[PDB]
Design an enzyme around this catalytic site. Structure first.
Site, mmCIF file in Angstrom:
data_model
loop_
_atom_site.group_PDB
_atom_site.id
_atom_site.type_symbol
_atom_site.label_atom_id
_atom_site.label_comp_id
_atom_site.label_asym_id
_atom_site.label_seq_id
_atom_site.Cartn_x
_atom_site.Cartn_y
_atom_site.Cartn_z
ATOM 1 N N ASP A 177 70.025 51.824 -21.727
ATOM 2 C CA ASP A 177 69.418 50.649 -22.316
ATOM 3 C C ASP A 177 68.396 50.083 -21.322
ATOM 4 O O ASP A 177 68.167 50.645 -20.242
ATOM 5 C CB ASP A 177 70.502 49.648 -22.738
ATOM 6 N N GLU A 229 70.402 39.357 -29.244
ATOM 7 C CA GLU A 229 71.121 39.615 -27.996
ATOM 8 C C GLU A 229 71.737 38.319 -27.451
ATOM 9 O O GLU A 229 72.332 37.576 -28.218
ATOM 10 C CB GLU A 229 70.226 40.390 -27.004
#
Ligand SMILES: OC[C@H]1O[C@@H](S[C@@H]2[C@@H](O)[C@H](O)O[C@H](CO)[C@H]2O)[C@H](O)[C@@H](O)[C@@H]1O
Ligand SMILES: *[C@@H]1O[C@H](CO)[C@@H](O)[C@H](O)[C@H]1NC(C)=O
Ligand SMILES: *[C@@H]1O[C@H](CO)[C@@H](O)[C@H](O)[C@H]1NC(C)=O
Ligand SMILES: *[C@@H]1O[C@H](CO)[C@@H](O)[C@H](O)[C@H]1NC(C)=O
Length: 606
Positions: free
Chosen positions: A289, A495
């Protein structure tokens, strides 16, 4: 196999494995490490891409050539980067990745589909496959070959800011929706070996099952945090859909920022190499990521040498750096030169990256197809998004008492009707996060139809539609309205910004519903990424619909409100009575939901 200057890896007729081995055998360490490096377009230039033999680029959320860029602008950008990569000694094309997670959502004019939680409500895997097919077309319209989707997180606590990116708290539903993968990539052949990567060709994209593993199981839904669960639970809840993804030939897997029982996933050799590669037989490439390896340490980035060692030894193949490429390449080169990371590990990583590239046809079609630009925002795809939005809606209430006339479906012909609320005429709000900007945005951020616009498009010509964002009680009582549609809910988030311990919608929302419903019969449309505290909204409302984050096609909402179709959606998550209950999932011992998983009222089409 024939001219004097023949190079086997450049021969499209040769088997992928032979091309991979032929190319790998020719590569310098610099060329190998280059393949393992993915950089942001924000730091890319032709010289950077050539000189560092870069393997991949991405656009992170909101990383665009400019606001409002056309499909052709995107194609020209991607092709410019590709020309530089093709000019290297070996001419290895780069792969360009993007978060196309509910359509090609960073791009102006792209169709925006409902987010995953609403898609879970449909219980319709073939719908999701078709969404994958349409998404691949709109991604390729922009010249991009690789989508960071699906998120197959199993969100076990809706306080998580990414809960809307999970199809369900029930792994069986998430497993079913892995049909996105063959939509994006194409169907695998009958003979197919589970774990091999697959993409059908230039009109499809590489997919990415993410984020491996247990991203949806973190304590209190804290994003990027620790998932405390035994191996049995990890394998029963968080892992199953990865196996379905292997069976469907997912090309890549992205590792989670999260930890499992205190071990960073980006440093977990047992799970990345021992399980994903050696047990599930995954043969595509594993990608980090965004600054994922940096976040192995506390503070993040405080020992990047260790980050590189730990992640590459754990089995990651491609690092989404994405900015400090020189440091990444320098450190990894040093580790190999010092024997800390063996050439076997480098060669495995590059084998996997090349396997995906050759398999997907990237060496045969490294450049964009200008004829695909018109796929962007195509009406047929919007019609599909509209179908999906309508199917995603969950009717929670349709009458205050069992004996009242049901409010829905509403009549299209009425003298005067009210449309109200912060979310009635706000395209950005109905799309939520990962739309144009990373965190989403407010207002008319792209091409679409708001709930207000949808109502105006639906009603009889004699029906007068009045909009008031936050009317007071007197306005409503004096207005001569037949009924009201009031839309409220969460603002866009993505997020960690979405992590939320209270799950109460912002005001004015409830106040507007109370003012409106106090004066006229009302249908409340709740826009959210997740269940939120809802009893007060329910108490005020004649009817209430959980519409999730339905995307650009607001007519999906009115298709059900006005009875063109019946309500069919069913909750893909538990609706809690209070946040003090959390976590609380279907099958738990002390299960006390406001609405159980699977709940949903129905109507019949008018
Ligand atoms: O965009 C690539 C991947 O990035 C992260 S989100 C990333 C974020 O961490 C960063 O701070 O900002 C970036 C750009 O705004 C985001 O894309 C996400 O965790 C992944 O799902 C996604 O595929
Ligand atoms: C979880 O979050 C807390 C509070 O921010 C933080 O201190 C801790 O390091 C996090 N743990 C993990 C594994 O990310
Ligand atoms: C709920 O939490 C969110 C995000 O953490 C915050 O913005 C908001 O102010 C909180 N709402 C209430 C009522 O405390
Ligand atoms: C909807 O149709 C079903 C199936 O025929 C029927 O049982 C139900 O009573 C109908 N409801 C309404 C309001 O028409």
């Amino acid at each position: 196999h024939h001219a004097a200057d023949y190079v086997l890896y450049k021969d499209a007729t040769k088997p992928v494995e032979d091309r991979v081995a032929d190319l790998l055998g020719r590569m310098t360490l610099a060329e190998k490490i280059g393949q393992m490096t993915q950089i942001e377009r924000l730091v890319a230039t032709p010289d950077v891409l050539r000189d560092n033999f870069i393997g991949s680029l991405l656009s992170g959320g909101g990383s665009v050539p400019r606001k409002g860029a056309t499909a052709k602008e995107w194609q020209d950008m991607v092709d410019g980067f590709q020309k530089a990569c093709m000019s290297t000694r070996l001419g290895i094309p780069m792969i360009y990745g993007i978060d196309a997670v509910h359509g090609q959502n960073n791009v102006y004019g792209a169709t925006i589909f409902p987010h995953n939680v609403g898609l879970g409500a449909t219980r319709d895997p073939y719908l999701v496959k078709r969404i994958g097919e349409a998404t691949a077309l709109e991604v390729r319209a922009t010249g991009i070959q690789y989508a960071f989707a699906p998120c197959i997180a199993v969100c076990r606590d809706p306080r998580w800011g990414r809960c809307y990116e999970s199809y369900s708290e029930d792994r069986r539903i998430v497993q079913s929706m892995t049909e996105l993968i063959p939509g994006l990539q194409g169907d695998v052949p009958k003979d197919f070996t589970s774990g091999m990567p697959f993409v059908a060709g230039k009109n499809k994209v590489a997919a990415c099952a993410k984020h491996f593993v247990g991203d949806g199981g973190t304590v209190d839904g804290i994003n990027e945090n620790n998932t405390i669960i035994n191996r049995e639970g990890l394998m029963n809840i968080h892992m199953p859909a990865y196996k379905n993804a292997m069976d469907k030939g997912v090309s890549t897997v992205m590792i989670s920022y999260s930890s499992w029982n205190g071990v960073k996933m980006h440093a977990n050799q047992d799970l990345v190499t021992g399980y994903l590669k050696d047990t599930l037989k995954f043969k595509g490439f594993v990608i980090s990521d965004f600054e994922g390896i940096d976040r192995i340490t506390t503070p993040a980035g405080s020992d990047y040498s260790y980050s590189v060692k730990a992640s590459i030894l754990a089995g990651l193949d491609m690092i989404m750096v994405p900015n400090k490429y020189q440091q990444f390449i320098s450190i990894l080169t040093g580790h190999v030169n010092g024997g800390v990371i063996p050439m076997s590990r480098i060669d495995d990583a590059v084998t996997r990256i090349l396997r995906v590239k050759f398999t997907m046809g990237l060496f045969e079609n490294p450049y964009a197809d200008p004829a695909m630009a018109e796929q962007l925002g195509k009406q047929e795809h919007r019609d599909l998004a509209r179908e999906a939005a309508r199917k995603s809606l969950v009717l929670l209430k349709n009458g205050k008492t069992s004996t009242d006339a049901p409010l829905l479906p509403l009549p299209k012909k009425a003298p005067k009707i009210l449309v109200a609320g912060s979310h009635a005429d706000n395209l950005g709000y109905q799309c939520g996060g990962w739309t144009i900007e990373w965190q989403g945005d407010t207002g008319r951020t792209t091409v679409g139809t708001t709930i207000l616009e949808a109502v105006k498009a639906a009603v009889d010509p004699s029906t007068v539609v009045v909009f008031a964002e936050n009317p007071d009680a007197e306005f409503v009582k004096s207005g001569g309205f037949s009924y009201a549609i009031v839309a409220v809910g969460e603002h866009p988030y993505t997020e960690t910004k979405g992590d939320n311990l209270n799950l109460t919608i912002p005001e004015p929302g409830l106040s507007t519903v109370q003012a409106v419903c106090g004066g006229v019969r009302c249908a409340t449309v709740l826009i959210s990424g997740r269940p939120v505290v809802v009893q007060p909204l329910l108490a005020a409302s004649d009817a209430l619909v959980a519409a999730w984050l339905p995307g650009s096609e607001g007519q999906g909402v009115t298709d059900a409100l006005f009875g063109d179709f019946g309500f069919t959606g069913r909750l893909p998550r538990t609706w809690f009575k209070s946040v003090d209950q959390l976590p609380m999932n279907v099958g738990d011992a002390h299960y006390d939901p406001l609405f159980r998983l699977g709940y949903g009222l129905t109507t019949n089409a008018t």
